[PDB]
């Protein structure tokens, strides 16, 4: 069986290794516009912030490793087209513009995504960088040497990380986005208000509710004009989302409005021999049980695995995702999973939430820390619809506990009393997650009288 | 109208008290407690002993004034002498004047808890042999410590471990003795307990295992302990050999296990429909085995204490069972577990297998990282997860609760292997260390098929 | 004295009457592109929803009226250029393209605003409609008797009211807004959730948190594409906001980053001989003491009067504004003034908030209604920064009382105790405004 | 700390709760002749007109709740003496006539007021009734059933309410008033003419400018004789006014000529250890900045909270009052605040007024209502002194907007232009309050 892989960062890497372990009698050929694989862009910000001392340690594999098991790995190759009918791909070597067309028995679309770039005059400016791959990274390190004033466009995870990183390293940092509050897509106001006061306490300038219009690169730097003001920075970084790199298959496979490849529960697109995984596909979102586009490295490794398991026939079903996510900002651990209250009612769902703030362990310990918590739930079925935790004590593991509850369709009543260890070194007699759910019950008890 | 009398009041009684009131306000609740204190965090003694509790009063989360402040007929310093399930009455003698009184009730709450295990050994009532459970024992251990350079803990549970570790860091010369083969063998397997022992030995703690204490002999030099394998002399010995349900008030009257622990239905109600049981005096449904068992943990007491309130009048909220989730911190190392151990499931003859994994909880390219030794116990046919544990100097305690939810929901090793879990280099690899743990299980099952 | 007035809708209409009465000797000339004046755009949604018998009532002044008062009225006239240093303006008679150049002593820039339009593909369609003036109203009034599907683009005041009018008159209403909450700029999330649910109760389809990529003329209608979906409608009404209509002076007087003319307390532009009022100028936002762009009719009528009074020498000062506003939606009266908590927290202001619901009058009365109230305030100075009220009972007036509170820099303690009448027909012993401020006092003391 | 409270209706109830909260240590003792508290005597007229349904709703507190909060609640007690120098109070149990004596550290004087009783022959008749008590209302409920002819003696708030109430439920209502026009104390003749005419609309006989000489008891009815006529009736209700019920301290603390206990900004009497709140005390009248007597429930609730606030030391200051009031007569809403033009002309104050009627919202709306407006002000400082509004539409809240204006000493110039929202559902572009002040602006410039 001849198998070809389009794109190879994380989704393609795991699929490659998986397909060769499950079907060693296969001829696997992978193409990638780049030269490397398995680069952890998730760790770029840490690298810029000075938290990474060896950059090659951000690669958990290499073209050599994949080709040691039998992978026909063609780096520097740009797949130019795929015809689902003749089952061939047209690729062009980037080292000499050599075009070729090969047939295949199965094709895996792991082409991922690409940053979203608006149609804003002045975009063409070189002082406006993108942030996605190891090439953008290596550019930022140097170009962040003589760029004292740096500006980030967007208000997502990347923008938050980049801003903090450049802020704790002696830069005049500015952050701009149409969002009303930072990281609105992941946390509710009570959380994002604390982060902004942090961003302000650390000198970062916040220009929210404003959308850029142009970029007039002067001899004094890059001049950004938003529809409410203008700012003068030395470098601007685009951090305003991802869009699936699904041009080759547009109109050729069922997609979402953004170009995300719809799939069944075994990673098969509408073309029964074309698979997708990662930033190029749409994941089943359990909180809504409807497909969604949530580009996360977690979906790329899992989806990449299932492809190998299901290449020849259906074997293991995708478990969907709660979109569990989190990060560290100014020593605070900020994690969440599932729906935010805003994102649930914005979809008209029957949703309520509780925001609890309790110390994570008894006050008699030598030290303790406040943990701000949120629980989104159905007021009728009592089904948990998501949660979030913020604390200088690493509460990140709790978000994965909430993820399990959502995966298992658990209610606030389940979480209110589910067994959880107790030890003053760790929590109160009731783990802070139990207490959180018991507030949901108390909330619903108030409404039942 | 409805007369409720609570027997005992540490944790299982307190919550039940606060619960009944808010749930059944037109009720007259009377509670008797031999002590003068309630809600004493005994689980903070070693921390107090170890010197990490400066304000010992912060170890109580309530007080009789509070309960009476809500309307509880609070009666401290009273010992319930007997209970008649027929005429529905109790006899109690005031400890301040030996005044007996027989009172009636419509419902009884049997939250009498437990008491340490004191064996028939010679030289036992020697004051150099002390107990550790309530606020009275801790206050004495505070005094008996100042003039007890050498200290011996008898047992091999979490307490003996917590106490041995606490004293060793405070300058004492400590020795540990127990019939067990490995420290905390009923909670962790060999790969974990061997590292714990290495810490002890690395901290000067003298470990004497497999030895059966046979006598204590008072001596102006101190106390001399005789074990079939040797004889030691310490200044103080602490009984840490487990609990026994303090239920003999109801013997022959309600269904109890071999150790006198009360059996309850799914709503904490004993075999007598008007006698509820919560906490260390009852047996809990153990989900990993779906049988009744004796897991005396403060987690059960508060939960069962609550359930007694919502159900005191009629079945309202079913008990969810327990996985026995527990864990401690020994020498800057987080040790937690939940469910069955491999040996404990094997010792029960269940289809069980296990993987032991050790990986850094987050990628090495981070400025720091710590190894996390992990263990998963699962059914090799059903692939159902039966138990697990983690050990690391990184606080992995919350992952034990994650495993608890998988067991509660009867999750398999495949579910845990691919369940969505966040990734951020500050916390873990692209796959959380729990996903990795479960994927080693699958790997273990993917071989014996071939 | 020669006085030139550009545009005459509301601000221009007031400055003219004021000027001709303040100094009934000057020569006043007013140029207006349209053929009518004094048209209340704030009545478009109420007709479209079928509530205005004779739409001739939406006009309160007229050219003949202004020319009788002594002004020279030139309807259908585009002003093609203003020459400040020369103090001249060049205009074209739209009726015959004829151009003339006239001199002025003073110029009044009442050019107002124009609806924001997106640089997009498909925006030129005849199914994409604007909604600002008399012409737009008749077009939407004519092309609405057949159009079953109607889509409003925007989450603001205009969009919310158009959706309500059409929805209440048998229409498939879809509101596509990029902001995640309808009318985010006026009410914190607590008020809007009831509003958004009110729309769902009435079958309106809300496409919030989406941006329209383009409009595409499809077979069975016009297809609207966003980043998360695509929508089919017969008519798309743009309610995305307004932009100052001040290109005539772009680079000739001090302007805000959006083109709004920056004035002083007497409405004088950076050029003294040039006054501005209404949607062409900025306004002093008393809550912050900064200049905001608050294009409300209340500001046009007020500044127009001040132009006519400060035309020679600064006579009366501008008081600023708290941007008091409100509307009626599905039986509910919804009013606001000053800042919300989100905007306050957004602009780096020390602010907290209390939310309170209460039956505006005693329950023993034959009837009563709950009132959802919000008060935004500085938690350490106690000063009131803004407030909002919502109820099926007409609480509109209470938004004016708050404005006077903000105008005088009152505190929650002032509002908590200030004298307010009591009679069971109207309120409780303590007026709900008193009760609203008292709850703010408790929160202040709770965290002390 | 020992605290004794005399009388517990409204001011007493609030001072109690404020003391128990801010001082859960002091010892609170309260005495009340009656067997209830918190009864709103403002609902009797509604309940007599059958507009209330469960008079148990006219009680917002109770002895139990107050005792459950930590106070000693002595119901059915008639304190018979106060000894400041000794700091004791002699009380008497009404259930057994017993008598004791208690010491106090602070005593709150909330004895309220009592209906002015006229020295008249026949004033003993059981057909002559009062109307201030919960018991009073019960006797008024029983009587009305067999009472076709009800006579109201007075020209103020209570009489007008009761007359309208009984007139709308099928009674022969006669109103006798020494005053020449009903409610001369709150509204100028321009408003009372409509009200007096309204009564003549609904078959209510007005006896204005007359004084009763006697009540002649008879079989077919009690005949009432005045200096100008005679009237037979089945029931005559007295509502001539209120008098301070403060004899316990006559000669022990400063008082107004009517007995009102003079307090300072912190509600303390001439004796520093005795507070006064409610109908027992005079209040600082902001419009005049003098002490006056206005027994309003709004006065009592505010002052009560101030006693518990400054009980130990002056903490919060009394902000004065505009005596904002209002009632619902037939199909109209009449509200007032501050001074009338007549009341100002009678006290030697620079005062002018304007009167403006106007449809409260645009006529193009489906419906609108005229609004009669009054604004009293100083014609040379432009300071606002008072105001009033009347209209079928609920303009109640606008009386509170004016009190804030008076509170902050604003002028007609502030009100003429201060920001106020516009929306046809609510008002014209300029709020009718703005229009009113603008009317006042035109009269000063008409004489400058
Ligand atoms: C549907 C809609 C509903 C609204 N509802 C409310 C409400 O309920 N409450 C409220 O307070 N506000 C409301 N507003 C806002 C209010 O209508 C505006 O703020 C008000 O119209 C501004 O008055 P203006 O005269 O200063 O400017 P405009 O009304 O915008 O008039 C500007 C004039 O300038 C003319 N002009 C521009 N350039 C030239 C030129 N070169 N030559 C000649 N003439 C020129 C234009 O023809 C135009 O007529 C609403 C607005 C809209 C569109
Ligand atoms: N720790 C983690 O797990 C991390 C995960 N990621 C993942 O990688 C992907 C890409 O990251 P990122 O770039 O942060 O994308 P995100 O979606 O996380 O953030 C993009 C943000 O930019 C805003 N935005 C979009 N367009 C514009 C515009 N024209 N002007 C101003 N602001 C705009 C959006 O706000 P609005 O939607 O309100 O318009 C949005 O919140 C994400 O999908 C995320 O899942 C990235 C970084 C860290
Ligand atoms: N962090 C936590 O979770 C903590 C939990 N607890 C709970 O409190 C309860 C009491 O704890 P603990 O006292 O440890 O009870 P445990 O049963 O947990 O520990 C007692 C141990 O002592 C050994 N032992 C018993 N009898 C003798 C004897 N005569 N001579 C020598 N050794 C003996 C047993 O080992 P073997 O079985 O090998 O013979 C047994 O493992 C437990 O249920 C525990 O779960 C208490 C403290 C901390
Ligand atoms: N009753 C009243 O007082 C009324 C007053 N007015 C006034 O008239 C003027 C015009 O009103 P209106 O049309 O409501 O203007 P508004 O600014 O009030 O409303 C525009 C709304 O549309 C949203 N929006 C902006 N751009 C886009 C886009 N590209 N895609 C999707 N949504 C977008 C904005 O949300 P976000 O800002 O969160 O992005 C904003 O809330 C306003 O200044 C207003 O003050 C109008 C009607 C009634
Ligand atoms: N909704 C509200 O706010 C209400 C408030 N109240 C308050 O309660 C208090 C008591 O009310 P009420 O007793 O009605 O007093 P009011 O002030 O309401 O009315 C009493 C009126 O009766 C007239 N009067 C006095 N003596 C005689 C007499 N011998 N013969 C005929 N007429 C006479 C007086 O007119 P003149 O002074 O012109 O001689 C006086 O204005 C008032 O102070 C009032 O403020 C009462 C009812 C409703
Ligand atoms: Cl072993
Ligand atoms: Cl929000």
Of A279, A211, A285, A281, the residue nearest A242 (C-alpha): A279
Which residues, 6+ apart, have CB-to-CB distance to D173 below 8 Å? Answer: D150, D151, D152, D163, D166, D167, D203, D204, D205
CA atoms of B60 and B53, how far apart (whole Å):
12
Binding residues of B for NADPH, by number, are: 156, 158-159, 162, 186-187, 242, 327
- Is residue C302 classed as helix, strand or coil in its secondary structure? helix
Residue among A319, A328, A397 whose CB faces B399 most closely: A397
CA atoms of D336 and D99, how far apart (whole Å):
46
Rounded to the nearest angstrom, the distance between the alpha carbon of B190 and the centre of ligand 6 is: 6
- CB distance from A208 to chain C under 8 Å? yes
- Burial of D191 by CB count in 10 Å (0-12 exposed, 13-18 middle, 19+ buried)? buried
Taking the C-alpha atoms of D157, D161, D164 and D166 in order, what is their torsion angle to the nearest 10 degrees?
-130
Interface probe with C: pick from D21, D279, D400, D441, most Cβ of C within 10 Å: D400
Atom of ligand 2 nearest to the CA of A116: 26
Residue B429 to residues A40, B363, B412, B421: CA-CA distances in angstroms?
A: 10, 6, 22, 10
- CB distance from B350 to chain A under 8 Å? no
CA atoms of B103 and C311, how far apart (whole Å):
94
CA atoms of A202 and A200, how far apart (whole Å):
5
Please report the residues numbered 220 through 239 in chain C whose beta carbons come closer than 8 angstroms to any beta carbon of chain D: none
CA atoms of C94 and D359, how far apart (whole Å):
38
Residue C220 to residues A6, A217, C123, C149, C163: CA-CA distances in angstroms?
A: 38, 46, 18, 11, 22
Q: Any idea which residue has 């035109």 for tokens?
A: D442
Strands D71-75 and D27-32: parallel
Burial B66-81 (b: 16+ CB within 10 A, else e): bbeeeebbbbbebebe
Pair of tokens at residue B1: 């109208």
Taking the C-alpha atoms of B365, B371, B373 and B374 in order, what is their torsion angle to the nearest 10 degrees?
-30
Atom of ligand 2 nearest to the CA of A185: 41
Q: Any idea which residue has 């009867």 for tokens?
A: B410
Of C321, C313, C245, the residue nearest C284 (C-alpha): C321
Method of determination used here: X-ray
- Judge contact between C404 and D411, C-beta under 8 A: no
CA atoms of A189 and A202, how far apart (whole Å):
20
CA quadruple B268, B270, B275, B281: dihedral positive or negative? negative
Please report the residues numbered 357 through 416 in chain B whose beta carbons come closer than 8 angstroms to any beta carbon of chain A: 363-367, 395-402, 404-406, 408-409, 411, 414-415
Instruction: Determine whether the interchain pair A181/C209 forms a contact, defined as Cβ–Cβ distance below 8 Å.
Output: no
Of D405, D334, D397, D400, the residue nearest D376 (C-alpha): D405
DSSP A125-167: -TTEEE-SSHHHHHHHHHHTTS--EEEEE--SHHHHHHHHHHH
- Judge contact between B46 and B71, C-beta under 8 A: no
- Is residue A22 classed as helix, strand or coil in its secondary structure? helix
CA atoms of A197 and A193, how far apart (whole Å):
6
What domains lie within chain B, and their CATH numbers? 1-34+61-113+245-325 (3.50.50.60), 42-59+114-243 (3.50.50.60), 333-445 (3.30.390.30)
- Is residue B115 classed as helix, strand or coil in its secondary structure? strand
Residue among C298, C328, C433 whose CB faces D419 most closely: C298
Pair of tokens at residue D221: 């009815």
Pair of tokens at residue B397: 């305690």
Look at phi and psi of residue C50 and say left if phi exceeds 0, alpha if psi is from -120 to 50, else beta.
Answer: left
Named by the residue before each, gaps in chain A exceeding 2.5 A from C to N are none
Is there an atom of ligand 5 within 6 Å of D243 CB? no
Rounded to the nearest angstrom, the distance between the alpha carbon of B129 and the centre of ligand 2 is: 64
Residue C35 to residues C20, C63, D364: CA-CA distances in angstroms?
A: 22, 9, 21
Give residue ranges with CB within 6 A of ligand 4.
C 118, 154-159, 177-179, 184-185, 211, 239-242, 295-296, 325, 327; D 423
- Burial of A96 by CB count in 10 Å (0-12 exposed, 13-18 middle, 19+ buried)? exposed
Rounded to the nearest angstrom, the distance between the alpha carbon of C181 and the centre of ligand 7 is: 8
Of B279, B289, C40, B146, the residue nearest D362 (C-alpha): C40
Residue C171 to residues B193, C66, C149: CA-CA distances in angstroms?
A: 72, 40, 6
- Judge contact between B87 and B222, C-beta under 8 A: no
- Judge contact between D391 and D332, C-beta under 8 A: yes
Strands A384-391 and C27-32: unpaired
CA quadruple B191, B193, B194, B200: dihedral positive or negative? positive
Of C400, C360, B354, the residue nearest D426 (C-alpha): C400
- CB distance from D331 to chain C under 8 Å? no
Please list the alpha-helical segments (H only) found in D351-431.
396-407, 412-417
DSSP B437-448: HHHHHHHHHHHT
- Judge contact between B418 and A302, C-beta under 8 A: yes
CA atoms of A246 and A293, how far apart (whole Å):
13
**Which of A39, A46, A157, when mutated, tests ligand 2's pocket best, judged by the most ligand atoms within 8 Å of its CB?**
A157
CA atoms of C237 and C147, how far apart (whole Å):
12
Around C271, how many Cα atoms within 13 Å sit in the side-chain half-sphere? 22
- Strands, sheet with D325-329, edge to edge from the N-terminal-most edge strand: D325-329, D332-338, D384-391, D370-377, D352-359
Residue D33 to residues A128, A415, D112: CA-CA distances in angstroms?
A: 82, 56, 12
Q: Any idea which residue has 């006896």 for tokens?
A: D207
Indicate the length of chain C as a whole number. Answer: 448
Give residue ranges with CB within 6 A of ligand 1.
C 6-7, 9-12, 31-34, 41-42, 44, 77-79, 110-113, 131-132, 158, 245, 248, 278-279, 295-298, 300; D 422-423
Taking the C-alpha atoms of B179, B183, B187 and B190 in order, what is their torsion angle to the nearest 10 degrees?
-110
Annotated ligand binding at C60? The verdict is no
- Judge contact between C419 and D301, C-beta under 8 A: no
CA atoms of B247 and B109, how far apart (whole Å):
12
CA atoms of A367 and A327, how far apart (whole Å):
23
Which residues, 6+ apart, have CB-to-CB distance to A200 below 8 Å? Answer: A206, C348
- Is residue B99 classed as helix, strand or coil in its secondary structure? strand
Around A327, how many Cα atoms within 13 Å sit in the side-chain half-sphere? 22
Look at phi and psi of residue B320 and say left if phi exceeds 0, alpha if psi is from -120 to 50, else beta.
Answer: alpha
Long-range pairs of A368-373 with CB within 8 A, sequence gap ≥ 24: A369/A393, A371/A395, A371/A432, A372/A190, A372/A191, A372/A194, A373/A432, A373/A433, A373/A436
Atom of ligand 2 nearest to the CA of A327: 1
Which residues, 6+ apart, have CB-to-CB distance to B194 below 8 Å? Answer: B182
- Burial of D145 by CB count in 10 Å (0-12 exposed, 13-18 middle, 19+ buried)? exposed
Q: Any idea which residue has 């995870």 for tokens?
A: A157
Query: How many beta carbons lie within 10 A of that of residue B290, not counting itself?
Result: 8
Burial C73-112 (b: 16+ CB within 10 A, else e): bbbebebeebebeebebebbebeeeeeeeeebebbbbbbb
With contacts defined as CB-CB under 8 Å, which chain C residues touch D157? none
Asked if chain A contacts chain B via 3 or more Cβ pairs within 8 Å, the reply is yes
Of A357, A367, A266, A359, the residue nearest A311 (C-alpha): A266
Q: Any idea which residue has 């080292």 for tokens?
A: A95
Indicate which residue of A10, A77, A171, A382 is catalytic.
A10
Q: Any idea which residue has 């579910």 for tokens?
A: B415
CA quadruple A295, A300, A302, A303: dihedral positive or negative? positive
Beta strands in C182-324 (DSSP E): 205-208, 212-218, 221-226, 230-233, 235-238, 242-244, 274-276, 283-285, 290-292
Ligand nearest the Cα of residue A42 is: 2
CA quadruple D45, D47, D50, D52: dihedral positive or negative? positive
- Judge contact between A171 and A143, C-beta under 8 A: no
- Judge contact between C218 and C127, C-beta under 8 A: no
CA atoms of C418 and C414, how far apart (whole Å):
6
**Which of C174, C241, C258, when mutated, tests ligand 4's pocket best, judged by the most ligand atoms within 8 Å of its CB?**
C241
Of B121, B159, B146, B150, the residue nearest B243 (C-alpha): B159
Annotated ligand binding at C32? The verdict is yes
With contacts defined as CB-CB under 8 Å, which chain B residues touch A362? 41, 44, 58
Around C389, how many Cα atoms within 13 Å sit in the side-chain half-sphere? 28
CA atoms of D310 and B398, how far apart (whole Å):
52
Pair of tokens at residue B119: 């064996």
């Amino acid at each position: 069986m001849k198998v070809t892989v389009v794109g190879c960062t994380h989704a393609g890497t795991f699929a490659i290794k998986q397909i060769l372990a499950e079907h060693p009698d296969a001829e696997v050929t992978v193409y990638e516009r780049n030269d490397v694989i398995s680069f952890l862009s998730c760790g770029i910000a840490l690298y810029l912030g000075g938290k990474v001392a060896d950059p090659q340690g951000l690669f958990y594999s290499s073209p050599e490793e994949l080709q040691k098991l039998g992978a026909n790995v063609q780096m520097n190759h740009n797949v130019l087209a795929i015809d689902p009918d003749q089952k061939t791909v047209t690729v062009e070597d980037l080292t000499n513009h050599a075009q070729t067309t090969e047939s295949y028995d199965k094709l895996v679309m792991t082409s991922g995504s690409w940053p979203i770039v608006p149609k804003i005059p002045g975009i063409d400016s070189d002082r406006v960088k993108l942030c996605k791959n190891w090439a953008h990274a290596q550019a930022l390190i140097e170009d962040a040497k003589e760029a004292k004033r740096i500006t980030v466009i967007g208000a997502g995870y990347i923008a938050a990380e980049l801003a903090e990183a450049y802020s704790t390293t002696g830069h005049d940092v500015t952050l701009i986005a149409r969002s009303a509050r930072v990281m609105r897509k992941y946390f509710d106001a009570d959380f994002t208000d604390v982060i902004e006061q942090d961003y302000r306490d650390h000198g970062v300038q916040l220009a929210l509710g404003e959308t850029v219009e142009s970029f007039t690169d002067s001899a004094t730097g890059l001049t950004i004009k938003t529809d409410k003001n203008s700012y003068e920075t030395d470098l601007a970084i685009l951090c305003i989302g991802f869009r699936p790199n699904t041009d080759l298959l547009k109109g050729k496979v069922d997609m979402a409005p953004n170009g995300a490849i719809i799939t069944d529960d075994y990673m098969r697109s509408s073309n029964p021999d074309i698979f997708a995984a990662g930033d190029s596909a749409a994941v089943h979102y359990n909180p809504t049980h409807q497909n969604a586009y949530i580009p996360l490295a977690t979906n790329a490794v899992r989806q990449g695995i299932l492809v190998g398991k299901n290449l020849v026939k259906p074997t293991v079903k995708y478990m969907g995702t709660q979109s569990s996510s989190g990060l560290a900002l100014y020593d605070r651990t900020i994690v969440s999973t599932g729906l935010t209250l805003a994102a649930a009612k914005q979809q008209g769902l029957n949703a309520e939430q509780v925001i609890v703030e309790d110390n994570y362990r008894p006050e008699f310990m030598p030290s303790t820390e406040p943990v701000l918590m949120s629980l989104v739930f159905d007021p009728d079925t009592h089904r948990i619809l998501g949660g979030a935790l913020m604390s200088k004590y690493d509460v990140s593991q709790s978000a994965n506990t909430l993820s399990v509850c959502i995966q298992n369709e658990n209610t606030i009543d389940d979480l209110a009393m589910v067994d959880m260890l107790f030890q003053p070194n760790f929590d109160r007699p009731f783990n802070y997650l139990n207490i959180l759910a018991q507030a949901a019950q108390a909330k619903v008890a108030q409404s039942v009288n």
